[PDB]
Amino acid sequence: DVTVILNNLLEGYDNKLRPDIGVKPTLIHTDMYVNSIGPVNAINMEYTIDIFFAQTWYDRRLKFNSTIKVLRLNSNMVGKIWIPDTFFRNSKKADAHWITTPNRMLRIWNDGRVLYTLRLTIDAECQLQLHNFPMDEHSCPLEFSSYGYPREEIVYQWKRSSVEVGDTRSWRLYQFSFVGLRNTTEVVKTTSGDYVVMSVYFDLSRRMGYFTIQTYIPCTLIVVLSWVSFWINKDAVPARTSLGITTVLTMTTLSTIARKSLPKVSYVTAMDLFVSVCFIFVFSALVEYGTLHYFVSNRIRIAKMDSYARIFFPTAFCLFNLVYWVSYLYL
Amino acid sequence: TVFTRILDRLLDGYDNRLRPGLGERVTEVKTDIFVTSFGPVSDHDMEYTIDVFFRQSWKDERLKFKGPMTVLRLNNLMASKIWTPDTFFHNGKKSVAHNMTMPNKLLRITEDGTLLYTMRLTVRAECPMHLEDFPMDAHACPLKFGSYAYTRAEVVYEWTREPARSVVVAEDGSRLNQYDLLGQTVDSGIVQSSTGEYVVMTTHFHLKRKIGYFVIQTYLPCIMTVILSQVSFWLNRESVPARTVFGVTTVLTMTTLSISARNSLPKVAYATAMDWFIAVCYAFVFSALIEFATVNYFTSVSKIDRLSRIAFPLLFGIFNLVYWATYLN
Amino acid sequence: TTVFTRILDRLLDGYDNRLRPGLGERVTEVKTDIFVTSFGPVSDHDMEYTIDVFFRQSWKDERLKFKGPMTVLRLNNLMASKIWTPDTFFHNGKKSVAHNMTMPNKLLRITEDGTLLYTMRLTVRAECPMHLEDFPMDAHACPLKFGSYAYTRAEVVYEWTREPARSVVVAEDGSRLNQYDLLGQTVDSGIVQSSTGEYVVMTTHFHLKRKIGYFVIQTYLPCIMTVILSQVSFWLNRESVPARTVFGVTTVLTMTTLSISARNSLPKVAYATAMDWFIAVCYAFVFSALIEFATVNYFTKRGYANSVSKIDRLSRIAFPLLFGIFNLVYWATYLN
Amino acid sequence: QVQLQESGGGLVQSLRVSCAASGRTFTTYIMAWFRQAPGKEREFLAAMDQGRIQYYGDSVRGRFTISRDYAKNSVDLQLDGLRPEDTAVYYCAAGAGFWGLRTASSYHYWGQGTQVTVSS
Amino acid sequence: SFVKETVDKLLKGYDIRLRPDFGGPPVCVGMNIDIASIDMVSEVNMDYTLTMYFQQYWRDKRLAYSGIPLNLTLDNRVADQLWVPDTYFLNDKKSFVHGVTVKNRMIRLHPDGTVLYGLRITTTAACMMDLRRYPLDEQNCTLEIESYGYTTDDIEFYWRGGDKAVTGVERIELPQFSIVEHRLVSRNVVFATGAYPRLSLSFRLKRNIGYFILQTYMPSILITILSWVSFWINYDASAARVALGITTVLTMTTINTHLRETLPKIPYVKAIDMYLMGCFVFVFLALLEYAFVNYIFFGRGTDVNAIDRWSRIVFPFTFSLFNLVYWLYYV
Amino acid sequence: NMSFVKETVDKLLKGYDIRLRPDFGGPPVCVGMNIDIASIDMVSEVNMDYTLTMYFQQYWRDKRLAYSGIPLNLTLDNRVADQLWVPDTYFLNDKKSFVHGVTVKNRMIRLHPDGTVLYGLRITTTAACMMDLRRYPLDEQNCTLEIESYGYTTDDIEFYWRGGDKAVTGVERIELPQFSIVEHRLVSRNVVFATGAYPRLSLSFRLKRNIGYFILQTYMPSILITILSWVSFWINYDASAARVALGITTVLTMTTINTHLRETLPKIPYVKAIDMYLMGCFVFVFLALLEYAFVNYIFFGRGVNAIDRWSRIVFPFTFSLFNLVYWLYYV
Ligand SMILES: *[C@@H]1O[C@H](CO)[C@@H](O[C@@H]2O[C@H](CO)[C@@H](O[C@@H]3O[C@H](CO[C@H]4O[C@H](CO[C@H]5O[C@H](CO)[C@@H](O)[C@H](O)[C@@H]5O[C@H]5O[C@H](CO)[C@@H](O)[C@H](O)[C@@H]5O)[C@@H](O)[C@H](O[C@H]5O[C@H](CO)[C@@H](O)[C@H](O)[C@@H]5O)[C@@H]4O)[C@@H](O)[C@H](O[C@H]4O[C@H](CO)[C@@H](O)[C@H](O)[C@@H]4O[C@@H]4O[C@H](CO)[C@@H](O)[C@H](O)[C@@H]4O[C@@H]4O[C@H](CO)[C@@H](O)[C@H](O)[C@@H]4O)[C@@H]3O)[C@H](O)[C@H]2NC(C)=O)[C@H](O)[C@H]1NC(C)=O
Ligand SMILES: *[C@@H]1O[C@H](CO)[C@@H](O[C@@H]2O[C@H](CO)[C@@H](O[C@@H]3O[C@H](CO[C@H]4O[C@H](CO)[C@@H](O)[C@H](O[C@H]5O[C@H](CO)[C@@H](O)[C@H](O)[C@@H]5O)[C@@H]4O)[C@@H](O)[C@H](O[C@H]4O[C@H](CO)[C@@H](O)[C@H](O)[C@@H]4O)[C@@H]3O)[C@H](O)[C@H]2NC(C)=O)[C@H](O)[C@H]1NC(C)=O
Ligand SMILES: *[C@@H]1O[C@H](CO)[C@@H](O[C@@H]2O[C@H](CO)[C@@H](O)[C@H](O)[C@H]2NC(C)=O)[C@H](O)[C@H]1NC(C)=O
Ligand SMILES: *[C@@H]1O[C@H](CO)[C@@H](O[C@@H]2O[C@H](CO)[C@@H](O)[C@H](O)[C@H]2NC(C)=O)[C@H](O)[C@H]1NC(C)=O
Ligand SMILES: *[C@@H]1O[C@H](CO)[C@@H](O)[C@H](O)[C@H]1NC(C)=O
Ligand SMILES: CCCCCCCCCC
């Protein structure tokens, strides 16, 4: 019964030619089911995504007259019929699955409509603008289109249930938090011709909990700590200098962690500015004492400088913090 | 010769594109697993390796045969020409079916027609983790598997033995460096998706992290560093160079520990339990140095020095009876 | 046009790809040579070096004689798989790659005489045992050994096409070495016996010498200067107890940082490399200098500034001298 | 002390000459052999690196057999088809064979040497 | 229908063992590349990775068809039954063709016989890098294309469209480098046997210095400046000047050692090591200067204040001069 | 002559079924093995696995392939292995293995006139070796390689070590970086289940770790630092600046040693022997600084050379005792 039907379909069928060749473009309805977005590898500007890609088209050559309305095939019958050559344009490295069998499906109706779903693991490529790091947002894309067929031969189109997600909290996003999702359709011109590109955007925003404890608090505390030498008596030359210099050693140690999880970009990220300014603040604290000590011993300015530093430095640091956070959190 | 003929006659007229009992019944697959070695668990990738012996047994009336033989051992090449369930792991990432020195598979057919498909795999599964109680956290790494192209009305999965004894962790099958397998839980359920409804067999391997490593490496050095900062309260107020250098160096020492402690911990945006302990330790060392600056600006032992010989050790002592009690219990 | 097609078809008629030429009649003789496009990077951690070659192989087969207007053919890779070819394998190739982008990088040329010429493009991660005792002043000879796998000596014999010296050519751009310097290569052939029988092995050794300039600036100079820094504290007056104590201890902390970073570059080993001894000696001098101050401090009666302690005078001479002597013994040993 | 000692030898008209190595482990070193004619020169005889590869000199190829006991860290040289021209002091040398393994200067450690007298 | 007949006839009797125009003039193989992205430009391995839409055009008269004004785009599997040039990349260490969902490959027959054959390769070329001037260096990484088994008597290579053959270079963003320009070369390698055609693609990456200014040079300068503060302290303040002096030496060592751990391991002297070693001498001399000052005053009890007075000028003067020589030498 | 040998091979292969073991229904087909190890590397405690490369060989007798009239041992091309029967031997504790394919798939098939067949392979396998590192680095690991038939019992197949104790060669020539192979054993035993005995062969080494690396890198730095912390006891209690600065820097120095050694040592999250020593030393420097805090208070707060004097002996004595207990227990 079913064996007879399958033999009829394959006979007189050439898989090198798309359906309705020389008549009209082959309309394809696609869908996706984002199983889990993997880690966002910021160093290599890539993110891993696992999906269940599904496609649907028509093929009059596969029509059959029977009471049976569906032929649920498997991963030994895909190559016989024509398959769209869809590839992910912004993919650095993509793999299908084969354990224990190739994760593929192929359902054929009696009216010619064909469904073809499969499971993929894609290392897409995403460009990151780390200017506001670690208070940044990104919209990592995912584009796919027919490779060899221009817009006059294959036309993609989202289905009504275009993109779906599973349990969002089960995603492997350690740092970023998924916030939104958009799907777009557009036409792109290349040397071979003009194609139809389908894009999915996953808006990601970084969570600042890790960095606040790791960097912003220890740096702020050290800057506060260096101000202690202003209240120390100016006759404790060994005390003020050792306190002054060791904070610089402490601040230098923390500057290591600022560039530890991001690529070697060549612009001042928001993190870089804060750590750099804290370095100068503790640096200026020791230079201030050096100026004060020189005029007291080696040679009304002297008394003022000890008193002014107790007020100006905390005020200067507070205004910088007021400017810094508003410049990023608010803008 | 007779044995040679019997094998050849089976595939005559047999089509591997159709599940057994197509249009007649629902194909029933019975499975059981032998976990030879529960491979390492990686916090950074939220995945765990595992090597199993995936056994599947179903019934196929198209392969009935009689003769002197009772149980066959077909070649794997012939096994490719017989319908097999398309069982796949839902959370699998990179699974390797071993091929050395031969395809590690085995197909046996009894005279009744029942098959016994056994294979050896190395499976990496997605195990989502919540490290908010690191390193005193527990996990339930799952392993789901079901059919791909067949709905719940065509292929149904059942455990061959009773569910509690259809998965057998090997006696020495524990390659966990840090965790400690408490025991597995086995259950089956129904999952619905866009294309239809499917039958899913689950398995939860409860794991508990061993805190012994972290106490020595992180908790004890931080506690001892904090105590060292509180020592300066007993130094006389006159020796300004001694107490000031004491205060700052410990802050540098505490900074060195906090840097290294987070290197082992996988980078996660949400603050873990350990990172809250270090910051409180950091707050105490910093507060000790500020305490001296208050003393020196206001120059018997000074009342601020005498008071802080009790407040600081008491507050830190209390903070441990809150941190340890909350997370452990 | 069709004449060429007919010639190819007749070649495989009756030809057997399971039997080497002249089976049970003579010894099949394979003449080979190697062209090195780029001597790849050498990894100390894995003790393996990469290399890209244009591996040529020539032998005579009497079953592929043909006559026609042409003299030399260029078979398709599909036809090249139906012709017996030597099973040359690399005795120390850990993981080798035969490129086929965008087409199989193979070339099978057949002459009317039957003298097959067979070239291919390979990338080989040959293993290279190393003795890092003299780190970083060592010099290895990473070898490259290739021979037959199935056929013994009495069946397949490998020879170099030309004189062995000129049978391995290195491109002038071949050296992809950051830390080593390819001095030259040695080419020789030998015989090996195993569980299955004798074999003919063609060996090539690429001599490598490690550059030393990086370590002098990174490790040797800071260690030498840091020791001098500690030894300079002997000129401070004996009454500066808070100064020399901070001076002495922080130098130890400085050397500790230097020793740790230096060993990170050094690959993970267990023996005592030449650099570890140098650091350890420096670590001893820094420790020794601080202990010297403690002995001096134990005899300082008055804490206000007495004359210079006799230990200080002797330590100003003995400590710089012994370290100066140690450098001679260290550098003379490892640079001769 | 790293002393390379060579045993066996003597006066004979089938001679096995061994070379026991003490004070150093030559598991990954070429325990080669050499012969020194009186006043003429020093000549290569045989070698065996870690991978058991055996090298031989074309002058006496097919006459001398070299074997290494990797467990005992010793190399044994077999003398067959002896001729009066072979009467010379034989030396056992070990090294990494830098700049080729057929050069005497390539081997760091050297043996004391044993003289074998051949008459016919 | 009609298309099925014509396509079958074209492959009937086709022999993939013969290049087009076997006895005639060499077949012209016009190439063209559309670079997608460049990443993992590694100084350690001296290599870089790029993904490209490699495409080739050649005219084979055996595939001419009439009556169909459509540029037939056959399935990607048809390429296994046609002749294609044996083009290989001379300086690649690892490469592949992405195969998701199918093997990325196109075949576009034309009525006149023109054949277009495009792939999508993520290769890893080999690039020899001179890093003496690192981080102020300009690398020149190439990509060599050659015919493996042919001479100029059978095959010929030429870029299609001349200087416009390669596209997408300007749209590449690298975290560190900056693609100043690219060039195209069409030269024939001439040997004794004959001439081998070759095409070359080559950019000129210029490293961006911004990252190293903030993380490396500024901490080195600021620490060195701090060491000079000890020339203004009283010479009797032995505790402070030593503590200030030695801690700066320790701080420099922290900066120097940390960079070695994070900067790529390139074990030979570069332009960054000379600067770091240069600064480490200045802080070393700063502390050594005081030890000379202290010995002169106490051990031999010129003016002791004179040495401090003299060093307050020479040290900032020399370090400024050292920077002037350094920057102009490498720029 | 040569064509006769072609006839002889065609005689054997024709009518030969690859699905039937030699003596299908009769006595079990004995299979002899003799590994020939080439190298061992990547002995990683992080994953508890090691990688070795071997010339794995299997001997067995098949009367269906014996030939007469040819006094040679035919060495057929390796591609003939697809047309013979070979044991389904697999390694029971391998994580990743493959047969080297350059320049051809490395294997040999040799047929002897009596029908004996030799089937060699060049296999590189990453076998898993569970390690017990509680005594690290004074540990003695024991690594194995379990070999077993997949789908046969001792009723059908029987493994044995060919050549007895000399079956495995090349063990001593191996040179691990940080180990020392002491001995190896060969085990030939039948694993007994309910169904029937499964033949198994086990090859097992006994690795021993060298200690020279850690003496000069971990134990020596920690002992030297601890001895320095005892210098505080020979400095007058009134030297508040000197003794506190000396004491606390060592505590910092020990922390520097511990943290940096932790990054260098493999990540093995459970208590080892090295950790106890490093932690043991950390307590001794901590108590030394804490000892002065008690001396300073008694002289000043409760105001005493005895406490320092009594500590000049106890601390060297106790630390020597700690080493005596530690080394004996761990050796
Ligand atoms: C340059 O060099 C590179 C290498 O360096 C080289 O790359 C190689 O390219 C070739 C193609 O040219 C690749 O081979 C193809 O791989 C296709 C898919 O690859 C995946 O699966 C591979 C194994 O597939 C087996 O298993 C599945 C699941 O069980 C099964 O469905 C398959 O039929 C097949 O089963 C056979 O093999 C298994 C063992 O593997 C046996 O157990 C079984 O009994 C049976 O014999 C797997 O090897 C691949 O792994 C590689 O790639 C992944 C990444 O994707 C990577 O992670 C891995 O490490 C590894 O590199 C991968 O997982 C496969 O579909 C192809 O087979 C098709 O097509 C060929 C075309 O010639 C045809 O001959 C076959 O018959 C078969 O026809 C299909 O089969 C479909 C699947 O079954 C089916 O749906 C279709 O209907 C159709 O027809 C069927 O045919 C079967 C069999 O006859 C029949 O039973 C059915 O009824 C029906 O008729 C082909 O194997 C190769 O993998 C690449 N290797 C590497 C290392 O990259 C490159 O080509 C070189 N270039 C040049 C120019 O030479
Ligand atoms: C990275 O580094 C590489 C290597 O240096 C750079 O690549 C080089 O780019 C330059 C500029 O594009 C190339 O020079 C050009 O070469 C072509 C090809 O010349 C060959 O083919 C010619 C075919 O007609 C032939 O005439 C040439 O013969 C001449 O040269 C040979 C020696 O090579 C000599 O023996 C002969 O007597 C001839 O003199 C040769 O076989 C050439 O056509 C170009 O000529 C143009 O420019 C010159 C400029 O003076 C002008 O005079 C001409 O009229 C014409 O306009 C030009 O010489 C060079 O070949 C490339 N190097 C290699 C190895 O290929 C690369 O550019 C660098 N990167 C970046 C980003 O720049
Ligand atoms: C088939 O392809 C050819 C080659 O690309 C097309 O001819 C070129 O088309 C482009 C775009 O219209 C023009 O800019 C060129 O001038 C054309 N060149 C020639 C020689 O005609 C041709 O138009 C395509 N045919 C169809 C039906 O798309
Ligand atoms: C075919 O192989 C057999 C087995 O290896 C060879 O027989 C060996 O011959 C050597 C040399 O005479 C003996 O030392 C062994 O004891 C023999 N082994 C056995 C099991 O008989 C035989 O010589 C080989 N054939 C040829 C032509 O060499
Ligand atoms: C996204 O997909 C939905 C269908 O799910 C569609 O209605 C919508 O128009 C798509 N977005 C855009 C921008 O077209
Ligand atoms: C904000 C820095 C505070 C430092 C100590 C100030 C003490 C003031 C006492 C009145």
* Contact flag A76-B275 (C-beta cutoff 8 Å): no
- Resolution, given in Å to one decimal, reads 3.3
B123 and B232 fall within a common domain: no
Q: For residue C1, what are the contacts with CB-CB under 8 A and spacing of at least 6?
A: E22, E23
A210 vs B150, B154, B269: nearest CB = B269
Instruction: Write down which residue in A159, A185, A207 finishes a domain.
Output: A207
Is the peptide bond between C136 and the residue preceding it cis, with omega within 30 degrees of 0? yes
Residue C5 burial (10 A CB sphere; 0-12, 13-18, 19+): exposed
A75 and A136 fall within a common domain: yes
* Contact flag A237-E98 (C-beta cutoff 8 Å): no
HEC states along chain B? CHHHHHHHHHHCCCCCCCCCCCCCCCEEEEEEEEECEEEEEECCCCEEEEEEEEEEECECHHHCCCCCCCEEEECHHHHCCCCCCCCEECCECCCEECCCCCCCEEEEEECCCEEEEEEEEEEEEECCCCHHHCCCCEEEEECCEECCCCCCCCEEEEECCCHHHCEEECCCCECCCCCCEEEEEEEEEEEECCCCEEEEEEEEEEEECCCHHHHHHHHHHHHHHHHHHHHHHHCCCCCHHHHHHHHHHHHHHHHHHHHHHHHHCCCCCCCCHHHHHHHHHHHHHHHHHHHHHHHHHCCCCCHHHHHHHHHHHHHHHHHHHHHHHHHHC
Hey, of E246, E263, E266, E296, which one would you mutate to test binding to chain C, going by the most C CBs within 10 A of its CB?
A: E246
The CA R_g of chain D, rounded to the nearest whole Å, is 13
Provide, as residue numbers in chain C, all residues whose Cβ is less than 8 Å from the Cβ of F39.
92, 127
* 8 Å CB contact between D85 and D53: no
Rounded CA separation C93/C123 (Å)? 10
Ligand 2: nearest atom to the Cα of E182: 71
Provide, as residue numbers in chain F, all residues whose Cβ is less than 8 Å from the Cβ of B217.
258, 262, 275
* Contact flag F150-B106 (C-beta cutoff 8 Å): yes
Q: Other C-beta atoms within 10 Å of E288: how many?
A: 18
* 8 Å CB contact between A239 and B240: yes
B161 and B22 fall within a common domain: yes
E abuts A (3+ Cβ pairs < 8 Å): yes
How many Å lie between the alpha carbon of F255 and the closest alpha carbon of chain B?
7
How many Å lie between the alpha carbon of E287 and the closest alpha carbon of chain A?
14
Q: Which of A139, A155, A157, A183 to mutate to test the pocket of ligand 5 (most atoms within 8 A of CB)?
A: A183
Rounded CA separation B310/C191 (Å)? 82
Under DSSP, is residue A160 helix (H, G, I), strand (E, B) or coil? strand
- The approach used to solve this structure was cryo-EM
Is residue E86 part of an annotated ligand binding site?
Answer: yes
Ligand 3 pocket, residue E71 CB under 6 Å: yes
- Number of domains, chain B: 2
Hey, of C56, C100, C249, C287, which one would you mutate to test binding to chain F, going by the most F CBs within 10 A of its CB?
A: C249
Ligand 2: nearest atom to the Cα of E185: 12
C187 and C217 fall within a common domain: no
Range of the domain at C291: 212-336
Rounded CA separation A117/A131 (Å)? 39
Q: What would the two tokens of residue C30 be?
A: 């394979």
* Contact flag F173-D71 (C-beta cutoff 8 Å): no
Provide, as residue numbers in chain B, all residues whose Cβ is less than 8 Å from the Cβ of A314.
none
Instruction: Write down which residue in A164, A184, A207 finishes a domain.
Output: A207
Ligand nearest to the CA of E55: 3
Give exposure, E137-160, as e/b (b: 16+ Cβ within 10 Å). bebebbbbbbbbbbbbebbbbebe
* Contact flag C131-D98 (C-beta cutoff 8 Å): no
Is residue C277 part of an annotated ligand binding site?
Answer: no
Whether the CB of A85 is below 8 Å from some CB of chain E: the reply is yes
* 8 Å CB contact between B152 and B190: yes
DSSP C134: G
* 8 Å CB contact between A140 and A47: yes
Tell how far the Cα of C145 is from the centroid of ligand 4, in angstroms.
Answer: 27
C178 and C249 fall within a common domain: no
Q: What would the two tokens of residue C71 be?
A: 């003299």
Alpha helices in F265-304 (DSSP H): 273-300
* 8 Å CB contact between C175 and C37: no
Provide, as residue numbers in chain F, all residues whose Cβ is less than 8 Å from the Cβ of B96.
96
C202 and C225 fall within a common domain: no
Range of the domain at A279: 208-331
Q: What would the two tokens of residue F145 be?
A: 């390689």
Q: Are strands B88-89 and A194-206 parallel, antiparallel or unpaired?
A: unpaired
F279 vs B101, B220, B264: nearest CB = B220
* 8 Å CB contact between C70 and F87: no
B255 and B293 fall within a common domain: yes
Q: For residue F188, what are the contacts with CB-CB under 8 A and spacing of at least 6?
A: F159, F160, F161, F201
- Number of domains, chain A: 2
DSSP A295: I
C179 vs E18, E246, E268: nearest CB = E268
Rounded CA separation B309/C225 (Å)? 44
Provide, as residue numbers in chain E, all residues whose Cβ is less than 8 Å from the Cβ of C213.
268-269
C288 and C230 fall within a common domain: yes
How many Å lie between the alpha carbon of B68 and the closest alpha carbon of chain A?
32
Q: What would the two tokens of residue A205 be?
A: 């925003």
Please report the number of interchain residue pairs, chain A to chain E, with beta-carbon separation below 8 angstroms: 178
Is residue F124 part of an annotated ligand binding site?
Answer: no
Under DSSP, is residue A280 helix (H, G, I), strand (E, B) or coil? helix
* Contact flag C260-F257 (C-beta cutoff 8 Å): yes
Is residue E124 part of an annotated ligand binding site?
Answer: no
A83 vs E68, E100, E102: nearest CB = E102
Instruction: Write down which residue in A207, A228, A259 finishes a domain.
Output: A207
Beta strands in chain C (DSSP E): 28-43, 48-60, 72-74, 88-90, 97-98, 106-111, 115-127, 139-148, 156-160, 168-170, 180-193, 198-210
Q: What would the two tokens of residue B130 be?
A: 């919540």
How many Å lie between the alpha carbon of C133 and the closest alpha carbon of chain F?
12
Tell how far the Cα of A195 is from the centroid of ligand 3, in angstroms.
Answer: 16
Q: Residue A158 to residues A55, A178, F241: CA-CA distances in angstroms?
A: 10, 22, 75
Whether the CB of C236 is below 8 Å from some CB of chain F: the reply is no
Rounded CA separation E50/E142 (Å)? 11
Q: For residue C336, what are the contacts with CB-CB under 8 A and spacing of at least 6?
A: none
* Contact flag E257-C257 (C-beta cutoff 8 Å): yes
Rounded CA separation B52/B119 (Å)? 8
Is residue C32 part of an annotated ligand binding site?
Answer: no
A182 and A218 fall within a common domain: no
Rounded CA separation F116/F109 (Å)? 10
Q: Other C-beta atoms within 10 Å of A305: how many?
A: 17
E277 vs C97, C221, C305: nearest CB = C221
Under DSSP, is residue C321 helix (H, G, I), strand (E, B) or coil? helix
DSSP tally for chain A: helices H, then strands E? 7, 12
Rounded CA separation E170/C139 (Å)? 45
Q: Other C-beta atoms within 10 Å of E185: how many?
A: 13
C94 and C166 fall within a common domain: yes
B252 vs A6, A177, A250: nearest CB = A250
A273 and A169 fall within a common domain: no
Is residue F259 part of an annotated ligand binding site?
Answer: no
A245 and A175 fall within a common domain: no
φ, ψ (nearest 5 deg) of residue B131: -85, 20
Q: Are strands B145-146 and B155-159 parallel, antiparallel or unpaired?
A: unpaired
C232 and C254 fall within a common domain: yes
A153 and A201 fall within a common domain: yes
Whether the CB of B225 is below 8 Å from some CB of chain F: the reply is yes
B252 and B199 fall within a common domain: no
Q: Fill in the amino acid letter for F11.
A: K
Instruction: Write down which residue in B179, B194, B210 finishes a domain.
Output: B210
- DSSP for F216-232 reads IIIIHHHHHHHHHHGGG
Closest CA to B272 of B224, B226, B320, B323: B323
* Contact flag B289-A36 (C-beta cutoff 8 Å): no
Q: Which of A139, A162, A186 to mutate to test the pocket of ligand 5 (most atoms within 8 A of CB)?
A: A162
* 8 Å CB contact between A293 and E233: yes
Nearest-CA residue of chain C relative to E83?
C76
* 8 Å CB contact between E142 and E127: yes
Instruction: Write down which residue in B170, B194, B210 finishes a domain.
Output: B210
C33 and C114 fall within a common domain: yes
D96 vs C131, C145, C188: nearest CB = C131
Nearest-CA residue of chain B relative to A166?
B193
Whether the CB of C291 is below 8 Å from some CB of chain F: the reply is yes
Range of the domain at F205: 1-210
Please report the number of interchain residue pairs, chain C to chain F, with beta-carbon separation below 8 angstroms: 188
A192 and A232 fall within a common domain: no
Tell how far the Cα of A192 is from the centroid of ligand 3, in angstroms.
Answer: 10
Nearest-CA residue of chain C relative to E266?
C178
Q: For residue F302, what are the contacts with CB-CB under 8 A and spacing of at least 6?
A: none
Give the CA-trace dihedral at F12, F13, F18, F24, to 10 degrees.
Answer: -20
Ligand 5 pocket, residue A183 CB under 6 Å: yes
